[PDB]
Structure 1
Amino acid sequence: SGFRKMAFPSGKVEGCMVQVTCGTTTLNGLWLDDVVYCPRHVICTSEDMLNPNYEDLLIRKSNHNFLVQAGNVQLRVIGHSMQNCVLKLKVDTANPKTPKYKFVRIQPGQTFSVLACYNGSPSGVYQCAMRPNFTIKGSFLNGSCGSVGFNIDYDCVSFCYMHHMELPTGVHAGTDLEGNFYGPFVDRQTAQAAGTDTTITVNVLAWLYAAVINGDRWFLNRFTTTLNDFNLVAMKYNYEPLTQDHVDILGPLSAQTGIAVLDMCASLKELLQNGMNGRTILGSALLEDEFTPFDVVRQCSGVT
């Protein structure tokens, strides 16, 4: 019992963190096998970030200009290449701590853990969701670029995010491990609009199931609704429209609790229309959308 915003154990990722320095700039790199991945803006000076020509900036750099340090270990760089917004620094030594891993591009609404790092050293771990607008509401300061987001299934780390930048609004933007930004962002010091965000409906419903499993049941009511009716309410309250695909993924939670997905939708509809009336659900006074249905099943069963 109890439900927490749980992050994956970060050990497998900590073993991969290195410091990357180029000229004046230092940030984090991810060392997997004989390659170190880091944001390509490591090659920029503060003045270059206004409108950087990365191809031209990288041409002035040689292998010996990229200083890669794994704490006390100095890595020898034998190749460098830019792939989208990431630099891939080939090193002469494969990381002995390389876990089984994959590079994945996550979907908006999915969750992942972040290992916030500074100067190649881990400082903390937290769980977050990729917002429907492709931003993350993380906790990052200068020097945190290169910190990565990941999920872990059995012994396999699926890397899904690399931190690149903080928008003028205080929200965060980054790329997949192929250097493709999530969302419309560009790695440049320019004001950039993040799209209109929405609340992740399927996740809120999953968290309402976790609340019932753990004893918070006050919000359950005698009503039901339809996908059509619920979606009119979701539209009014800036929630993602619920689809049959979302209902299908809530099947295990509906099956465990015996509460039909549309019956849970009617509880969510009433909470949207009436608020929480000064009460809490799983220690929260708002509707939480950072737990996917898989996260709920995992935490509620005890998956290691």
Structure 2
Amino acid sequence: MAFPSGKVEGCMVQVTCGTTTLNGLWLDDVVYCPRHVICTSEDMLNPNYEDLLIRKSNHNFLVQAGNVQLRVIGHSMQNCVLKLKVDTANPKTPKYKFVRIQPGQTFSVLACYNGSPSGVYQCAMRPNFTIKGSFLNGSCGSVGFNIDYDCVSFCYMHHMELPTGVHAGTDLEGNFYGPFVDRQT
């Protein structure tokens, strides 16, 4: 039962900080993405995110909507998500809300790679707050949603695959579902 993905496809962007790259969600004039993007490969195992944040400037972020670069004019960190303020509002922004779902609820996921939509499928949140998704490498920042009439409810931002092959992430305010932390361990 996956929801049609057209309204979300127009919101996906590629976010690059140095050589680390993942997917971002562009709504109005804000891009949301996992804060993990500010890690170099050596920081990924045990990042000090407050320190890494101090060291970055707006011009260290490259945001691409397709072949169009968007100018970053502000950035801030909210729990495990980074919010990049860009100088252009997304003209395909749908009506949307952010919601936090519970175990047992289902949602659709738009898997993206390097900012480009790749597939859509339905998932359920398990009681241990993991999901059995279909995510490959490069899918970090892909989002889960439901459609509520005309309104897109965003409920899941993908961060990591765990050793057993299931997946974990945050709501759109950056709070993990479950007892996980955004580090490569």
Q: What is the TM-score when the length of structure 2 is the normalising length?
A: 0.98
CA shift, 1:59, in A, is 1.1
CA shift, 1:141, in A, is 1.4
> Match of 1:25?
20
CA shift, 1:34, in A, is 0.4
Residues 215-249 of structure 1, C-alpha deviations (whole Å, 9 max, x = no match): xxxxxxxxxxxxxxxxxxxxxxxxxxxxxxxxxxx
Q: Secondary structure at the match of 2:51?
A: helix
CA shift, 1:110, in A, is 0.4
Residues 95-151 of structure 1, C-alpha deviations (whole Å, 9 max, x = no match): 000000000000111000000000000000000101111001001112100000000
Choose between structure 1 and 2: higher helix proportion.
1
CA shift, 1:20, in A, is 0.1
Q: Which runs of 5+ in 1 are unaligned?
A: 1-5, 189-303
Taking the aligned partners of 1:108 and 1:49, their CA distance within structure 2 comes to 28
Taking the aligned partners of 2:109 and 2:41, their CA distance within structure 1 comes to 25
Of the two, which has the highest radius of gyration? 1
Q: Secondary structure at the match of 1:81?
A: strand
Check if 1:14 corresponds to 2:12. Answer: no
Choose between structure 1 and 2: higher strand proportion.
2
Residues 249-287 of structure 1, C-alpha deviations (whole Å, 9 max, x = no match): xxxxxxxxxxxxxxxxxxxxxxxxxxxxxxxxxxxxxxx
Q: Secondary structure at the match of 2:165?
A: coil
Check if 1:148 corresponds to 2:138. Answer: no
Taking the aligned partners of 1:158 and 1:120, their CA distance within structure 2 comes to 20
CA shift, 1:46, in A, is 2.1
> Match of 2:43?
48
Q: What is the TM-score when the length of structure 1 is the normalising length?
A: 0.60
Taking the aligned partners of 1:139 and 1:59, their CA distance within structure 2 comes to 35
Higher relative contact order (CA 8 A, sep 6+): 2
The sequence identity of aligned pairs, in percent, is 100
Taking the aligned partners of 1:38 and 1:126, their CA distance within structure 2 comes to 20
Residues 141-194 of structure 1, C-alpha deviations (whole Å, 9 max, x = no match): 121000000000111000000000011111100000000000000001xxxxxx
- Residues 1-304 of structure 1: pairs in structure 2 closer than 5 A: 6-188=1-183
The count of corresponding residues between Structure 1 and Structure 2 is 184
Taking the aligned partners of 2:56 and 2:134, their CA distance within structure 1 comes to 31
CA shift, 1:73, in A, is 1.5
Moved over 3 A (4+): none
Q: Which runs of 5+ in 2 are unaligned?
A: none
Q: Secondary structure at the match of 2:44?
A: helix
